[PDB]
Design an enzyme around this catalytic site. Sequence first.
Site, mmCIF file in Angstrom:
data_model
loop_
_atom_site.group_PDB
_atom_site.id
_atom_site.type_symbol
_atom_site.label_atom_id
_atom_site.label_comp_id
_atom_site.label_asym_id
_atom_site.label_seq_id
_atom_site.Cartn_x
_atom_site.Cartn_y
_atom_site.Cartn_z
ATOM 1 N N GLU A 11 0.799 -1.221 0.000
ATOM 2 C CA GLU A 11 0.000 0.000 0.000
ATOM 3 C C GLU A 11 0.830 1.269 0.000
ATOM 4 O O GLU A 11 0.309 2.325 -0.377
ATOM 5 C CB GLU A 11 -0.903 0.056 1.236
ATOM 6 C CG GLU A 11 -1.916 -1.082 1.301
ATOM 7 C CD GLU A 11 -3.049 -0.946 0.308
ATOM 8 O OE1 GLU A 11 -3.190 0.124 -0.343
ATOM 9 O OE2 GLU A 11 -3.843 -1.898 0.196
ATOM 10 N N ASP A 20 -6.618 6.103 -4.724
ATOM 11 C CA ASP A 20 -6.191 4.718 -4.856
ATOM 12 C C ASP A 20 -6.271 4.289 -6.327
ATOM 13 O O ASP A 20 -6.594 5.087 -7.212
ATOM 14 C CB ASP A 20 -6.931 3.825 -3.857
ATOM 15 C CG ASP A 20 -8.382 3.573 -4.225
ATOM 16 O OD1 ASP A 20 -8.869 4.003 -5.308
ATOM 17 O OD2 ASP A 20 -9.050 2.877 -3.421
#
Length: 162
Positions: A11, A20
């Site tokens: 991440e 994202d």
Amino acid sequence: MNIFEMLRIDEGLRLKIYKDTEGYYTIGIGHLLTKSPSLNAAKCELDKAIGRNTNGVITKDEAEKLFCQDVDAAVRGILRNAKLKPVYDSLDCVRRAALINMVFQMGETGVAGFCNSLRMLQQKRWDEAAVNLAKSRWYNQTPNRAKRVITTFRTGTWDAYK
Ligand SMILES: [Cl-]
Ligand code: NA
């Protein structure tokens, strides 16, 4: 090497609001803020999640606290789900991390919908599980991350994260 290190690799870490891979406002180590296109709505969620007026920027300690909560929530989602809990209970510690990683990325409901992959994982048919897991939007949209998670299921090692 553990679930926190693994997801930190997958991440990354950003201290300011970003989007994202699906285009959704996110902060920290993959903490989804909202699916709304409004950056103002994302800022409210951030302030609500942090407990102060942040203006889109948090500290590393705040990011790591959200991360602690998010990993915990992924595990909770697994343990409360009739499809995911038996798989999780059947897995070794390394492969449990791979399942947590999927739930962290896609949510409990999405992962619970891998019904054939879940059966192969429970039966320890690792190569067949690996092939089945790659027949997914997940693999096609985030293939490098999916390959690392699948390799973890296939081998039961951390080799893809070295
Ligand atoms: Cl990827
Ligand atoms: Na993006």
